[model samples]
Target: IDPETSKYFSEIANLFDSNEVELEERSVICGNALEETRGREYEIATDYIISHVLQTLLEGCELDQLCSFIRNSASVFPAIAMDRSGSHVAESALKSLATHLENPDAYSVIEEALHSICKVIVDNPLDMMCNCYGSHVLRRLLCLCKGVSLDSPELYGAKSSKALAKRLNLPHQGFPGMLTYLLSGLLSCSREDMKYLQVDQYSSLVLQTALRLMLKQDEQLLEIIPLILRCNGFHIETNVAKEILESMKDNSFSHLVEVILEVAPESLYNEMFNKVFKNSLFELSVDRCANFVIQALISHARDQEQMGIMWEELAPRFKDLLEQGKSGVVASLIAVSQRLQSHENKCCEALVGAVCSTNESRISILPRLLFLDYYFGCRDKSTWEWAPGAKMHVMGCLILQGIFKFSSDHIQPYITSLTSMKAEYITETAKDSSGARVIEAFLASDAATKQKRRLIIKLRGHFGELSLHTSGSFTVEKCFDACNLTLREAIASELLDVKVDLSKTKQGPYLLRKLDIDGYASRPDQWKSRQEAK
Candidate 1:
């Protein structure tokens, strides 16, 4: 918006944008820009076009120049706080600062600049956190404090467009003290102000970040959750614990409940579960937003006792939830069932019975799930197909892999079904991206020695054909490792037969080196010795 400053910033963008300017020349430009920003820092930062140049400077400027910018911005940050483009300028400052903390001299300047900035923030913590533009800066600052980089998805609760970025750390000080002072100023506000913070579009994020990253070592962290969820010890039955339970149906505020579920102490968790969330899970699992909190309950429960209660509630409805696009919820339930070792068999029987739907149909469970929609909706085995070029269903892969993690004795029916399949079905499945892993799971599983050999026999004629495929090559390698020595010799002869055509495919070259086909072609004794060594 600053028309007067636009000309100056346009030239700065030109210099940084040029492909010809090297780092040494750019440092000279950086020095000159810092001098020009001396009296006009506020006007430049608050302008729409000029604000971008400030970020460009931060991106390639020297560390001392960066420290100089931080001190200058802290001097005018109050004016910058309420303006739209100004927030991005402040955001860039905190983001680029992350890589510059290694130098003690520059770090001392940053440490002092942040101290001056915190004094301003502590004087009016709620106002800064609630302001639309100011809150973005605070969220980045909190990331800097906790060792999470500013661009990380860990900093945002609701969905954001930030691409996932790798982070590196430099030791931090004074930022934790920034957190200590900010919390004191925040909680000292009026009680009504505290309630407003949970639902405000900007402030809710800052609160959620604070809730998740604050250490258990901080005693105040424990009290803050109860404070957010506080309700009148109201005599009657109807109200939100703040905006919490009611917000369970709201996209914006419901994320608050998920975070609380994640970090709450046992007393708080038990109180919420028995009183508020106990009877509502069936309903919650179907809502647009509320179902996520149900997921968090399953993921981060107080103990297995609570999980036992949840299993009872969710077990009878696995089929219902599966039909409703809640496959992950069912998948999650199955994993915890195995973890607690409480209901693993009952858990397996219910879902398999629902999908297979007949006495003889039990043998088809793995295939039915691996080809989920194609088989399940066909109503009879005669009409089902693993059609050519079809994408594998997600639920089928996840469910079968979960089954592979079961106890060896419990896997007999699944293993029997694989043995029952005619050779073509096993060969075809090994070529699919998703279908390949289920077979690998069985090979890698702790099944009996005889069972692994039974599965390997079906691949006898297909080893070379599989090795020439894109995804199938990995499956072929696993089969080679599982085969008996005579069977290994058979796999070796088949590879040598097509070793010419095999070299043309994407995976073929690696497969030849890995299987030692070269040694087998020229020296049987050497290949035999290597196999014997292995």
Candidate 2:
């Protein structure tokens, strides 16, 4: 987390985000820094902060200048991957090279040197596969080869994927044939040898990274995915068969199963869902060890055809899953409903059903749906935890938007409960930049205009207040559009009531025209009658 470096001191680390001239001056000084270690580049990898200096330089320096760093480190690829600290510099070099993909000068040197890294990786998958730090660098190469940044949200699993290296820019391009070559070489090992990776902790994560990063029609995946599952434990029996998906649920390979559902071919995935996973879909959805795989299966189940099959078992269980504290599973089901556009009405019904019971005072269910089990604390469904701190809870806001996007008829139930939130509470959602968007997304939805009217009217006393905050101003304009002419004038009136204060804001004039502040004044009666005529 700390970048403390001034040649390994604190201040120089601060200037990487610097203004250009200071940036250029640092670039000049970096000329000394890179060579200050020069041939000792790999030798200095052990000096942690200096590695950042090396990376920060490689990051900002012209691409042509990086050939030296790659050249000197190419011979140490084997040692670099296993080193506790040195791997960052090695990963840094791959990441920085990704930015200048169009530069031929950098491309040539990167291409030549990475082959050596690939050589070490392909020939000896065993050496670093289980090593403590090796899985990350291994995954970066996989990410780099497939155009995903190492920092991509999906690259690392649910566990935060935090690495010492800073995030790279989005959308990297893999070296040509690099991914195919590395995987083909790694997969070429004898099947018994493959058994080694299937069981060890870190190697399974590396294999999962490859599976996640692979694009279909790559023949290499056909071999790798089946090989991984079959040898790990593939039998032909029905329930008694040692389905690795079931057996490995408690093993490291369980996550590997999650990645398999992600990359498996369309027909092949349908095969697994039907043959390997269908009967267990409901059971595994609550698996103490395997529920995550079911979550992945729900997200990757491909088509409506497959979803229809799985929904029979899982749809009604939405509330049941929540009671078991399976919030993540419920979340996946909701998201897949949106993506596949399948069973949306049922999905909404189940979620609303899950969040509340027959109680008329179900207003708290909306908050429960927003925060998930975090605040809901599902002991007996009555034990709700109410800690919604000052800032908007992102997951709450995220789930709320999806719920809004549902078919208006379906979300009507949830909307009735949501719009019932206190006017003061309604305004609370609008204050944060992100919190404000939940209302924007709601007003922007296909819900009934009457429901929309209630949402806007609830914010009546807060329209000027909403318009003052930067993001809140945008929400006010969205309300203006959702409003009937009378409701709109209500907005314009409240907004102009604070005209002096409103105009002082950066977004003020923007909202003033949205309700036509000048026109409201210049042609007051005309504006009113004209709006009426429309």
Candidate 3:
């Protein structure tokens, strides 16, 4: 029943060839293949055997064994996975290369393999190996060449150039040197009509990678910021720009702000600020943007430091765009104002300017104005009153007015008039339950209730809407009763109940009288006795 050891290899290879077999069985066959080559002289004999097994993977080469062998002994089978016969063998090889290339000397043996992989990447742009393994290999190569002359054109070939360009499209190459290489390439070849060299052809991912890279090496980034400025119109690249601005706001490279200002002109300043402001507010939602803007403004006002020299350099021409009734800009400005307030004199000055500017723009900002009024107006109301749910426009308006300082003189008269105005316009005229519901709704809170009282006093004291001659004195108790009575009518109307009485108590209008027991008794004791003799 035992097969000869010579035929054992043939039988095992065949048994392993069946794709339906379990990996454990295939692993055993691969182990036996490896055992057969253990006694061979040099490594060529085993290399060929491993190569044969690697070549026909479906005929039974376990990927785990291949990965493990290549990781441990890459020279034995450097081209094992690079073979085009297997689908991802090259990728498996590359992933293994990433582990071995750390030894630097392994680069020589893998150099040809690397060249072939790079060729594949160039030939097939979306090849999974090109994007994943090739991208990773290029990064490792860059890392390997960090202190060497490999970065020099004399040492590295055009393959490096093409590899750099293709890998630039992949986001995994986020290393600082990798970024520097890409940025330098774009800047140097910007004038050329080449596909990858033109900065305009580059996507947001490239810019994002550059931004992140520059975040670490500010010196390297300093020179390129000017170039980036020359080629603008990346509003769609908001996410990347926002992240950079947010990090800048956090003091990662505060010193570089001055350098950014030096070369960046006023027009560019405006464009960048507008871009950064939009990115900072709407996209990133980083509160630090506002904080940074405030700090810069206060610094500018106090003469302690030049705030956003680059931004200020352009503010004269573009400040309007930054301000242009954009609430995010204004909010950021106000945030600066609030922070500066702790510094006393400077903050007060800025606060004054902000308040004056806000007041001037009030009429044009009706929604923001009403939002603020209502926000302060209903500060003490329940959570349901302020949840905002689908009403963010209203919330935006409130944020505009509530957080900013206001001029007392401008707001005082309106504040006074608001009370009387509501009273005059919101009188309960209908005898229907709707009238009662309206009154209750008005009296639900301190603000609402106070307004209702003012209205009641105004109507009874001045307008006679609530009087003995009219109906009766307008009171909170009376208002509550009326509202409940009205609600009863609404329910009754729906449920088919008794008729609502109109003459019982004309509590809100004229030609009404209070029913006093004395007045009723004072009338004739009998209807016949009370008749007049004509």
Order the candidates by TM-score, highest first: 1, 2, 3
Give the range where candidate 1 is weakest over 10 consecutive residues by summed lDDT.
161-170
Residue-wise lDDT of candidate 1 within 204-224, one digit each (tens)? 787777777774633655667
Model 1 alpha-carbon drift over 4 Å, by segment: 1-5, 18-22, 75-85, 104-107, 118-136, 157-174, 183-204, 215-221, 231-243, 373-388, 460-473, 489-512
Per-residue lDDT tens digits for candidate 3, residues 1-534, read 123533655555576666777777665666446445432312322333333443333234444444443334333222322233322433334444444444555545545444433343333322222232333333333333232212333122212433222221102222344335534543443322222221221222233233333433545545666454334232315654554465444332332332243234344444455555432332222333333343332222322122333223322322232233333333333333333333223322332333224444323232222333343244452221222222233223322332323332223322233344433333332111223223332344234335445544443322222332222234333542333333322222221111122234354222222222222235523321322220
Worst 10 residues of 3 by lDDT: 165-174
Q: Please, what are the lDDT tens digits per residue for candidate 2 over residues 1-534?
A: 223323353445555556655766766665555665556566666566566666776676655466566666666765776777777777777787677665556565667656767887787777677776777778777767665653765565544413101110003555748877877776676666666677777888788777867757556566667667653232334542354555646667667777787687776676677677876777787777577778768777688987787778887787788767666666667777788888888877777776677665366766665556565554555666344555655545656677787778777777887788877767777776756867887887888778778878888888888888989999988887777788878887787789899898898987886677777777888778866775
RMSD of each: 5.1, 6.4, 21.8
Q: Count the backbone clashes (under 3 Å) in each candidate.
A: 1, 2, 4
Question: CA lDDT of 245 in candidate 2?
Answer: 50
In model 2, how large is the Cα lDDT of residue 423? 79
Residue 278's lDDT in candidate 1: 78
Best model number under TM-score: 1
Of the two candidates 1 and 3, the one with more favorable lDDT, higher being better, is 1
Please give the CA lDDT of all the candidate structures. Answer: 0.71, 0.69, 0.35
Model 1 TM:
0.82
Write down the TM-score of every candidate: 0.82, 0.76, 0.29
